[PDB]
Paper text:
R388 has 35 genes assorted in functional groups or modules, among them, a gene coding for an antirestriction protein called ArdC. Interestingly, ArdC contains an N-terminal ssDNA binding domain and a C-terminal metalloprotease domain. ArdC is structurally similar to DNA-binding dependent metalloproteases involved in the maintenance of genetic stability such as Spartan or IrrE. In summary, our results indicate a new mechanism of DNA antirestriction played by protein ArdC, by which plasmids increase their conjugation host range.
R388 ArdC crystal structure was solved at 2.6 Å resolution using a selenomethionine-derivative protein structure solved by single anomalous dispersion as described in Materials and Methods. Using this preliminary structure, the apo ArdC structure was solved at 2.0 Å resolution by molecular replacement (MR). Apo ArdC crystallized in the H3 space group containing one molecule per asymmetric unit. ArdC is composed of two structural domains: An N-terminal domain (residues 1–134) and a C-terminal domain (residues 151–297) joined by a long and flexible loop (135–150). Electron density was not observed for the N-terminal residues 1–6, the flexible small loop residues 33–39, residues 136–141 in the region connecting both domains and C-terminal residues 294–297. The N-terminal domain is composed of three α-helices (α1-α3), a three-stranded β-sheet (β1, β3, and β4) that supports a long and protuberant β-hairpin (β3-β4), a smaller two-stranded antiparallel β-sheet formed by β2 and β5, as well as three 310 helices labeled from η1 to η3. The C-terminal domain is composed of six α-helices (α4-α9) and short three-stranded antiparallel β-sheets (β6-β8) as shown in Fig 2A and 2B. The surface electrostatic map reveals a positively charged groove in the region of the N-terminal domain adjacent to the C-terminal domain, suggesting a DNA binding site between both structural domains. The surface electrostatic map revealed a negatively charged catalytic pocket. IrrE protects D. radiodurans from UV radiation DNA damage by proteolysis of a negative transcriptional regulator, DdrO, which represses the expression of DNA damage response genes involved in SOS response. These proteins belong to the gluzinzin metalloprotease family characterized by the presence of the conserved residues HExxH located on the “active site helix” (α5 in ArdC) and an additional conserved motif (E,H)xx(A,F,T,S,G) located in the contiguous α-helix or “glutamate helix” (α7 in ArdC).
Residue numbers in the entry: 7 to 32, 40 to 135, 142 to 293
Write the structure that this text describes.
Amino acid sequence: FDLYQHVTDRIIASIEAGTPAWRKPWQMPLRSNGEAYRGINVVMLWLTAAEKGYRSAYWFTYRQAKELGGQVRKGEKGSTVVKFGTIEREDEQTGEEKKIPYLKGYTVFNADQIDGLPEQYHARDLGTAADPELDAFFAATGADIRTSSEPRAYYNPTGDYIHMPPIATFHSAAGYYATLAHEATHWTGHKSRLDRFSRFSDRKSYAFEELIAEIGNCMLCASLGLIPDFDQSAAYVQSWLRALKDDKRLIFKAATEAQKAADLLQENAANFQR
């Protein structure tokens, strides 16, 4: 079937239900080798886990479960994850090789659906003051963070800095750092970094940047042990629905861009290099 439309339809339904897929955790989903899923697969597996009530982070193909001594239980239904790539094909008239880009599906099962797996496969309280570890992380991203009494958090792309209100006015360090995480996600879109604002001139006012930032903030908060704030997104949800109904590929681009934003903050903070 149409993988693009199948995923987009699942997302549209979760939004119309009142709980968008990427909000469901409120636990990164992992492959059988322990590596995290990425991009649109994170969103799909969060949704499935919530829909079906799974608690394990791990997802297996039937074969991967078999190789580990596990058996998918009778009657259990798998879940779709997608892979993009290129594959070698030939012209036909000529034999010229031409790598073709493709989208394909895989079926995976949560560890909770499987008997016999090794046992390995079966939030920090921050109070109201600054946290040394989270302060160190955000400093290491490279973001210029400025503070004033203005009671609004935002990323200023022209001066290229994040404005935060004072932490004491949140009466919750968790709320402070979740808010900073959200603005740091926007901060990755600057022309000198991921360059989202010029690449996605959003003429049909799909609120595409806010969708990327919300998904990217969920990914970043998942990895930081924080709880994202969703209350500042009611104004965009209708445009997101409109966008998804118009373009069955859009949520894939948004999830990929979201993943790139979360990647860049974590790479900067680890002094990642090639």
